[PDB]
């Protein structure tokens, strides 16, 4: 059923587009200045804040880049937003940029300070997918969460308590948790945890176990290809009418869109452009914990590890100066594409028979199997 699912999500994409365009028209930005992932970000956050303000806005004058610090009527923003979505709320839409931010953060940063202070092993990176993602996120917002993500929550919810309505949360938070697991025991053991009203160290210690079980017997976690507002704004402006032509977040749609995107980014004096593009690209598909081998395979070019990556973050801090600042064009194109999955595999070869698709292969017709016998460069982005 390609009617609701493909076209209803198109309608949520149209909203973000339309809105971004309107909002650019207010700031009186240029074309080059609307394609600046920097400005796009600021706008996206202005909105999520207002639906739950001001921000950094970079301008282009003869030669150099000027940063403007601006503020907007928190309600005006909310007004312009609905205008774009037909006076609807389109929580989906806000939630979408809620993820784009997530997926960018799960790749720009490593959240160790928090894992340990919770009592999780820092080496449990690959399980913290969406730890940044506000609880306000929707139902299809939590499905993107890693097993480890859930644990850090319950453990804190439990840790402060064990140190009214709060109960329905805990059980559900576990049901979700449990719905991540895809094996008998895994599934059953989650229940044995959900049994205690005041679950103390008994649970505290047990879930941590299950956290580690997922390192081997992974769960089902959905991945959503969520592109920056500018990319959708630009697309909408170019005529693409997604609600009518359909769109996906786990199909070929997102890759294809990024095959024509003209996104620019601010880049510090000593940073490596190629390295910058890599980052953004990995946030566009939630590939921050993917096997570097495969990421590079599909990417088309080396996908260098975080340590060897030359960049500190895409957003520009108030500390820095503009004099020594310039901007590059982000390389977001990829070689092939792949069905962003949810499954963690089980039996060691996973996704037996599943392959990669050419960017011409619109339909999921002919699959391609990668052979990794090769001089690779690692598997752990972190």
């Amino acid at each position: 059923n390609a009617t609701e699912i493909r076209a209803s999500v198109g309608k949520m994409i149209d909203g973000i587009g339309r809105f971004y365009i309107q909002m650019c028209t207010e700031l009186k930005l240029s074309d080059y200045e609307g394609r600046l992932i920097q400005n796009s970000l600021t706008i996206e956050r202005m909105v999520l804040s207002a639906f739950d303000t001001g921000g950094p806005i970079y301008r282009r004058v003869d030669g150099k880049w000027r940063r403007e610090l601006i503020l907007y009527d928190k309600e005006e923003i909310r007004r312009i937003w609905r205008q774009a979505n037909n006076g609807d709320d389109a929580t989906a839409g806000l939630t979408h940029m809620m993820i784009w931010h997530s997926n960018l953060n799960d790749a720009t940063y490593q959240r160790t300070r928090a894992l340990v202070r919770t009592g999780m092993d820092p080496r449990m990176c690959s399980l913290m997918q969406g730890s940044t993602l506000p609880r306000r996120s929707g139902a299809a917002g939590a499905a993107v969460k890693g097993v480890g993500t859930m644990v850090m929550e319950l453990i804190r919810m439990i840790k402060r308590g064990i140190n009214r309505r709060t109960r329905i949360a805990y059980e559900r938070m576990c049901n979700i948790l449990k719905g991540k697991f895809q094996t008998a025991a895994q599934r059953t053991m989650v229940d044995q945890v959900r049994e205690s009203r005041n679950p103390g160290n008994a649970e505290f210690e047990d879930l941590i176990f299950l956290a580690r079980s997922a390192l081997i017997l992974r769960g089902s976690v959905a991945h959503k290809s969520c592109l920056p507002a500018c990319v959708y704004g630009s697309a909408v402006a170019s005529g693409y009418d997604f609600e009518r032509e359909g769109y996906s977040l786990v199909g070929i749609d997102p890759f294809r869109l990024l095959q024509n995107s003209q996104v620019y980014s601010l880049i510090r004096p000593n940073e490596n452009p190629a390295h910058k593009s890599q980052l953004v690209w990995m946030a566009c598909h939630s590939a921050a914990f993917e096997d570097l081998r495969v990421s590079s395979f599909i990417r088309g070019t080396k996908v260098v590890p975080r340590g060897k990556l030359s960049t500190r973050g895409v957003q520009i801090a108030s500390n820095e100066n503009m004099e020594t600042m310039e901007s590059s064009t982000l390389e977001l194109r990829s070689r092939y594409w792949a069905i962003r999955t949810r499954s963690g595999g089980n039996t060691d070869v996973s996704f037996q028979g599943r392959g990669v698709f050419e960017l011409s292969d619109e339909k999921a017709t002919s699959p391609i199997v990668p052979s990794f016998d090769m001089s690779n460069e690692g598997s752990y982005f972190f």
Binding site: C125, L127, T341, S343
Partner: peptide
């Protein structure tokens, strides 16, 4: 250490999953 130990899979392909 302080590094990764397993790989979270993002795509559907024939891939030995590292841990």
């Amino acid at each position: 250490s302080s590094g990764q130990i397993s790989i979270q899979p993002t795509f559907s392909v024939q891939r030995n999953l590292p841990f």
